[PDB]
Design a protein around this nucleic acid. Sequence first.
DNA 1: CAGGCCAAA
DNA 2: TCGAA
DNA 3: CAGGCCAAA
DNA 4: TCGAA
DNA 5: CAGGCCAAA
DNA 6: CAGGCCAAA
DNA 7: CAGGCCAAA
Lengths: 54, 429, 54, 54, 53
Amino acid sequence: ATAILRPIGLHVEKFQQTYRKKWRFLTSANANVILAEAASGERPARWALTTGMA
Amino acid sequence: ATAILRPIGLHVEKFQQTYRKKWRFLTSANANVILAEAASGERPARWALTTGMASIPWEYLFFYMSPAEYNRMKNYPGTFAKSASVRIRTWNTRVAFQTGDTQTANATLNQNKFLQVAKGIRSIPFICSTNRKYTYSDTEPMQPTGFATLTSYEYRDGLKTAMYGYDNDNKDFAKKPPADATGAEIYLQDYLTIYTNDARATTGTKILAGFPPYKNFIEEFDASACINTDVVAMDYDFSYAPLVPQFAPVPNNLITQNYNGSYPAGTKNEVTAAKTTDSSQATAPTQVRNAPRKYIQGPHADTTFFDEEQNYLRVPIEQGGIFEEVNVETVHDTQMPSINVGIRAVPKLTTIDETTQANSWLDAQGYFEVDCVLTTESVDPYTYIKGGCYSANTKSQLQYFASDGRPIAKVYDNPNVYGRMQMIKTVKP
Amino acid sequence: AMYGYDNDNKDFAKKPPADATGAEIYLQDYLTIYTNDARATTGTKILAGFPPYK
Amino acid sequence: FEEVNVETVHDTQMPSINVGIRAVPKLTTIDETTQANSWLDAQGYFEVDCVLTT
Amino acid sequence: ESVDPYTYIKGGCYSANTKSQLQYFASDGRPIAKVYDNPNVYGRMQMIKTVKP
DNA sequence: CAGGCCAAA
DNA sequence: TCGAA
DNA sequence: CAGGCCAAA
DNA sequence: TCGAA
DNA sequence: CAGGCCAAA
DNA sequence: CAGGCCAAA
DNA sequence: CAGGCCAAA
């Protein structure tokens, strides 16, 4: 029995794209210093310890 | 030495899409009858010989993509149709047991059934045939007796309407259900016609050659043994077929004063040339460069053709020679083969008093399943950092334009000249 | 149509039991595809037509 | 239907079987490019064997 | 990745019903989205209303 | 290419 | 183990 | 033995 | 490399 | 054959 | 020892 | 991945 028609489904077309970038970053070596942050609104007063990793 | 950077070039993204359709066509077996066509304007008086092979419109875009696919394809600039393919298979051919006439009909179980196929008739220099629609007689539905007023554009529009239905808001929506949805058949009504000069009104010297033997250029098969068989299989790689204009490049006039500078092309022909010929031999052929043309994208774009969608069903997909690129290129004229298929008329069993062809014919219909595929490609350059896609300057495209503003395009409906297609102004829809 | 009527029914002679006779049963329920009728729609319209159910 | 037993439940449905013969166009010619205007009568013959286990 | 359905014959691309997408919205109309700038709670990100540019 | 979506598997 | 693998 | 001619290849 | 070998 | 049911595994 | 916890894997 | 365009080879 020859099949003139078959369930070929929908004609769905799928596209793929890729994006490449190269960046150069300069980061300073900050000291580890304790800074006082005042309370404001919902934020309570807290001590802050900075770190040099960007 | 480590390389932190390398010439990675541009970020060009290429998309490929394919479109598949399956159509069922019914073609009647017209008789071979000579019809007189009166002279009108530039057309001289001519005798017309009808033939029963219906044409397969595989050179047009609606044959491959639905309106939704075409509307979405409009959103991808730089869309070039790379290839097309068509396969025609034949099913059981039907022949009437007996016609409406009953006094002399002589119904018969036995039947002779022949199928004619033509592939290169349109490109033959001397045949000068064309595709026409007839008006059949009441007593003999297989005997044409004239020509219908429907042009090729109207015929293709009606065929597309039969294929894809109407809009939901149209009042005639209930008339023609979508064949692409139902799987029904579509009666083909455009058939081949051979032509010859009508010497009756000619004054002076006359050409009395008659019709050319066009039967020597067509295949013919026994339709009884062709049940469920592949008859036609054609592939066509398009030389140049821009469906959507390329991305508009960044103009160099806003940056550099050098934009108008010239540069030597050498002996190479960088500009396409139009050739005008006269088959009446009253004037020698002429080749003209710098033909009137204008850009199809950019600051001074003229997108009349694509806005009019002439390439959907009014103009064939293949448009080589029409479109020029500013890139260092080579261009040659291109055309597509013409597929004609149909059943030969079956003579009635009644006897004939004199030696001549059949006077009456049995009704017949051929059943053709057509599977068509169209493959296209698209490009997005991403040349500049901001402001969307822009293409390179060398990718700028121009199209031939008439002095009155109408673009010039190929048409396959007119008969060929010198085995070549003819350029003509597009007509506004 | 498949199983006939009860013996006390007046219409018992109309439809013999197909399970007993082996006769056929004409089917009368067929599939129907649907699409929106945009003729009376006011404002934006959906003009997609029928889906390719084939 | 739910049970008081510690259970897992998911929605269920059955496939729909549709079978039938396509209409046969009449041999008469048609003046314009469109589908068939008249059709020959046709009937398909289907033997269905069904089993249910409980 | 991208997808074009071509579900219907005419009128451009239309997707299936099951592909319909909803987004969380505040009672005032501003959509809700993830932000990685605020500190985590329970090792989890926090949903917050987007601010109009 | 039918059973809770298919363009997922 | 509300298919069933 | 169909695509810019075929009687050319 | 406006088919394509 | 006992632990979120057993007539399920 | 980075992705909805780590002292679980 | 430079020489008459590159997203063609």
